[PDB]
Amino acid sequence: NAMYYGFDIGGTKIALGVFDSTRRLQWEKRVPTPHTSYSAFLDAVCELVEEADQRFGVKGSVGIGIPGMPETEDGTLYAANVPAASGKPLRADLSARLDRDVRLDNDANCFALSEAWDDEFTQYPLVMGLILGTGVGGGLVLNGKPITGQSYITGEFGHMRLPVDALTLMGFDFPLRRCGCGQMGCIENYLSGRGFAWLYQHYYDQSLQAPEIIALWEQGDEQAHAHVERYLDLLAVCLGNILTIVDPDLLVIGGGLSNFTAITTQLAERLPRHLLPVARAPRIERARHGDAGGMRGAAFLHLTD
């Protein structure tokens, strides 16, 4: 009768999803994220766990996805959009309040874990989740457990510089854009939704956003088509480098751009030219649990020891 609770904590709302032992969602509830004080934040979360416990007559396990640093070396959380909890030992405090092992991970790792636990995808030991949306990020999952790395940096694909073969493709004068992290040329600024739009403007001198370019592509516009071919080629070159070091069985692509089917259907054929001769491309799939993934991944933190 084990139940798995998963919280997706964002700047606006705290979303709880409750899953049974077969990973099916049984109940959902969302409340506003308190920003006023840590005590109000702790209560928002604990009251939801208590409500679920009462509703299902069980002590559910509790997993939580955080957009930031879940637990530093000393046990401290840091998240820009969750000021009420930042600087606090969230994991320890919630664990004491709920008398159970509350587990935390970042939102990109929860996204990857949610996909790795899709019924069909559990057959793949090593799953790489790639998010192409507001930013670029992701995570790595091995045998159903996320690989967090020393500081929850594993899977920060958006912050690896363009490889030199991107200059061979685009020209050596291709702009190396300044990233928010401070480096020059991070792939996030070419492959995110904004990067996709920037690349269009770079070639065509028109300020269209991704939806608009996609609309033109669907209507058969020649520029939009030429733009998408370049984007896909650049995505492939960048992925060639990542896949050569990670070698995942499955690459699942999520985020806003993943709704553009060309990104997951026309990518596989472009990979072999950037992979080792003896390498096989990973299976490539569009994410299957967009909306519910934050809650699923958080809940799934308790599916492994």
Q: Is 31 annotated as a binding residue?
A: no
Please name the helix (run of DSSP H) or strand (run of DSSP E) that holds residue 296, with its range, or none: helix 293-300
Comparison of 32 and 182: residue with beta carbon closer to Zn ion: 182
**C-alpha–C-alpha distance, residues 280 and 211, integer Å:** 33
Q: CB 268 → Zn ion: shortest distance, Å?
A: 27
Q: Is 232 annotated as a binding residue?
A: no
Q: CB 197 → Zn ion: shortest distance, Å?
A: 18
Comparison of 183 and 266: residue with beta carbon closer to Zn ion: 183
Comparison of 125 and 149: residue with beta carbon closer to Zn ion: 149
Q: Is 159 annotated as a binding residue?
A: yes
Closest CA to 299 of 46, 92, 102: 102
- Dihedral-angle region of residue 182 (phi above 0 means left; psi in -120 to 50 means alpha; beta otherwise): left
Comparison of 17 and 195: residue with beta carbon closer to Zn ion: 195
Regarding beta strands 250-254 and 283-286, do their DSSP bridges make them parallel or antiparallel, or are they unpaired? Answer: parallel
Sheet with strand 61-66: strands edge to edge: 25-32, 13-20, 3-9, 61-66, 102-106
**C-alpha–C-alpha distance, residues 214 and 203, integer Å:** 16
Q: Is 245 annotated as a binding residue?
A: no
Q: CB 164 → Zn ion: shortest distance, Å?
A: 17
Binding site for Zn ion (CB under 5 A): 159, 179, 181, 183, 186
Q: CB 202 → Zn ion: shortest distance, Å?
A: 18
Comparison of 94 and 132: residue with beta carbon closer to Zn ion: 132
Give burial (CB, 10 Å; 0-12/13-18/19+) of 208. Answer: middle
Q: Is 142 annotated as a binding residue?
A: yes
Comparison of 151 and 207: residue with beta carbon closer to Zn ion: 151
Closest CA to 273 of 300, 230, 244: 244
**Cα dist. 168→67, 140, 236, 277 in Å?**
35, 29, 13, 20
Q: CB 183 → Zn ion: shortest distance, Å?
A: 5
Q: CB 64 → Zn ion: shortest distance, Å?
A: 26
Q: Is 6 annotated as a binding residue?
A: yes
Regarding beta strands 25-32 and 61-66, do their DSSP bridges make them parallel or antiparallel, or are they unpaired? Answer: unpaired
Q: Is 7 annotated as a binding residue?
A: yes
Binding-site annotation: residue ranges for Zn(2+): 159, 179, 181, 186
Binding-site annotation: residue ranges: 6-13, 135-142, 159, 179, 181, 186
Binding-site annotation: residue ranges for ATP: 6-13, 135-142
